[model samples]
Target: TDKLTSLRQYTTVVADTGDIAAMKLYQPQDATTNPSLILNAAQIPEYRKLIDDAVAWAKQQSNDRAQQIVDATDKLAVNIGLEILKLVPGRISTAVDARLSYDTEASIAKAKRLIKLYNDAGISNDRILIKLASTWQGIRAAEQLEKEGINCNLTLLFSFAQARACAEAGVFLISPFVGRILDWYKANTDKKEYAPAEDPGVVSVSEIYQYYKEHGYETVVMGASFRNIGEILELAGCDRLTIAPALLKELAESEGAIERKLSYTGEVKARPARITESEFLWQHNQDPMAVDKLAEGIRKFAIDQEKLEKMIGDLL
Candidate 1:
């Protein structure tokens, strides 16, 4: 069997793309999309209809230019998510505006709006996972949303503090970015290469996975943003792994013996006390890599998000 087929035995594979054709071909269990992925897809001529439709719908909803574009952006995201949902049997992660990452109320409002769009389209809330940044505000937004039965997938996660905060908040899942962490270390530090076993990204995700299992936290750990198949392989038994199509195709074509590198056994221990906001902030600050990457991640996404909105504005 191909490595993908072999790996599926242990991990739930998620596609990290907004392209419907890719999801159809690879057939990931779930799909995740952000502004960057959506922007990439929106430029494709085949997806022009989706963008046009969103523009038309937004114009009808509001007379204000800014409001219309915001609505259109949200519409475009859900439109893509709706398409992805049809191919995947599981949920679709539709991200909130990255600009709202620091605004708890705005993030929550935007999430609700996205959820309402899905609900109106005949897709139930259960089929959706609202994607938010791993900011303290974003995590707080997720906490309240989870209480309302609106599941969330916390993205741009870099530190253990982020993971622990999400778990404490009862977040449905947390996406600890593997490749991005490795990207930081390689660029900022002298150690430029790492074996799969010793990859800093792999180590971070593995540690988080172990911590989650050891404490019996119900929050799912989904290792994401992988740069190579080795990172994915190292996390074979994670709750889920969101992979790109290129790597998915590589795994699909390669025939190899796959190993389950992460697993848990024995009795689970009691949950630890909640992480306070002060401690969460300080611990996250101490890790320069996490601080740098989280800020960079948000800025990058926000830029793409603005680009996507500008594209929509031009259409209008």
Candidate 2:
């Protein structure tokens, strides 16, 4: 067995919050933030000062307070990411509006805008990952973004088909939503409980990881949205995990623990997977549950994004 939490033996821990101050303590390999994270981060005392300062700076620069606020919010997200990144050697992910999951061209424009902002901040494209929902349009946007040297991390990924599409498009990374998937299964089905090793979420990620490893896909599969230590432990050897600060605290407090379980050579020894566009669409279209939940997830986040943008005044 690979030594427990040998630090060297386990996966690379990535911070999942938008709070840059929290990032200072864990020194996570990379940082990830979403619309909710930005909203949540701005409410914190230390980070709120940054938000207020951003508002003031924007107003001085722009003729309209509303436009300035919107611009400031966008810039604010990037600025916090850049600040945290200075402490870590890895890239920081600032996501696009999840509501645009199905809008290919629009998603492309927003991601490019985010990149340009980061570029102005002196962050290289190689060190930045544009986060978009794992929708067909979002994946398509990523395909084009990749052509321009912008790496992407497809977030809110729930199914194997989602992974298949991302890999086919040559995305840099895919964050499979483990705990969320399990939550869906548990909430929807009669199985109200799951064992540590038998978690549906864990099983879902393992299948994708194994498939990607065996297929020699270029995308890195990262397990995310974990709900408990059981799911995290089950994915100990994932390429990376976009975990919450609370979870990171627990891991740090537990001492050397958790067995690193996944290995490319040992677990996945099959031939590459073949997925055509036709097959992909049919599979996605046929799965009513994935279809409905994915749509719901996108709408929920989109509404939140709009709310955040309205407060900033640029979302209309």
Candidate 3:
């Protein structure tokens, strides 16, 4: 069997792209899309019909130019998500606007609308996961939403503090970004060489995975934002791994047995602790890497979101 086929034995492989055809190629259990993927997909000619449909829908929704642009962007994101849902048989993580990352009410409101868009399209909320940055407010917002029966994917997660808060909030899943964590360490460290076993990104997710399993928390761990297949392989046997198309293609071409590195059945000694809002915020402040990188990621995604809106503006 190909490496991709073997990978399915230990973990649920998720396609991390906005392209429907790419998701079909790998046949991941689930797929993910964000502003960056949607922005890139919008630039492709083959996806022009999806973009046009959203733009056309926006025009009918509102006549105000500014409102039309805002409505169209949301519609465009939903459109891509709706199309992706047609391919993947499982969940699709549709991110809320990054600008709403820190605001609790707005994030929850935006999440509700995104779910409604999917539901109105005849897609159930069971197949949709609202991706929220793991800000203290984002976690609380997710807590509220989960109580209402909407599942969420807590993202931009780095430190154990974020993971702890997420578990306490009863989040559906937490996407601890692997590659981005590696990037932060690489930029700041002096010693360069590191093996997959010692990779900081892999280590972070491993800790979170162990903690959840040890403490009996049900929040699923889905490693994301990988820079290479080595990091991906390092975290094999995780609850799930969301891989970009390029890396998915690389794994598809290679052949090997992927050793499982993580499992929930193993001994877990960590004790669960109550993570209050103040404690969550304080812990987030204490972790310099998490603070800096989360800020940087939000900015990057927000900028791309603006770019997508600009492209939609031209269409309007």
Sorted by lDDT (best first), the order is 1, 3, 2
Q: State TM-scores per candidate.
A: 0.98, 0.90, 0.96
Tens digit of lDDT per residue, candidate 1, span 248-314?
9999999987989999887899987899999999999999999999999999999999998888888
* Most lDDT-accurate candidate: 1
Q: How does residue 222 of candidate 3 score in lDDT?
A: 96
lDDT digits (tens) for residues 150-248 of candidate 2? 999998777678888888899999998877777777888898899967887788789988888887776888888878776787787888888898877
The clash count of every prediction, one per candidate, is 0, 0, 0
Worst lDDT 10-window in candidate 1:
307-316
Pairs of residues clashing in candidate 3: none
Candidate 2 lDDT for residue 258: 57
Q: Which sections of candidate 2 miss by over 4 Å?
A: 1-8, 60-69, 266-277, 313-316
Off by over 4 Å in 1: none
Winner on TM-score between 1 and 2 is 1
| TM-score of candidate 1 relative to the true fold | 0.98
> Top TM-score: which candidate number?
1
Give the whole-model CA lDDT for all candidates, comma-separated: 0.92, 0.79, 0.89
Q: How high a TM-score does candidate 2 get? A: 0.90
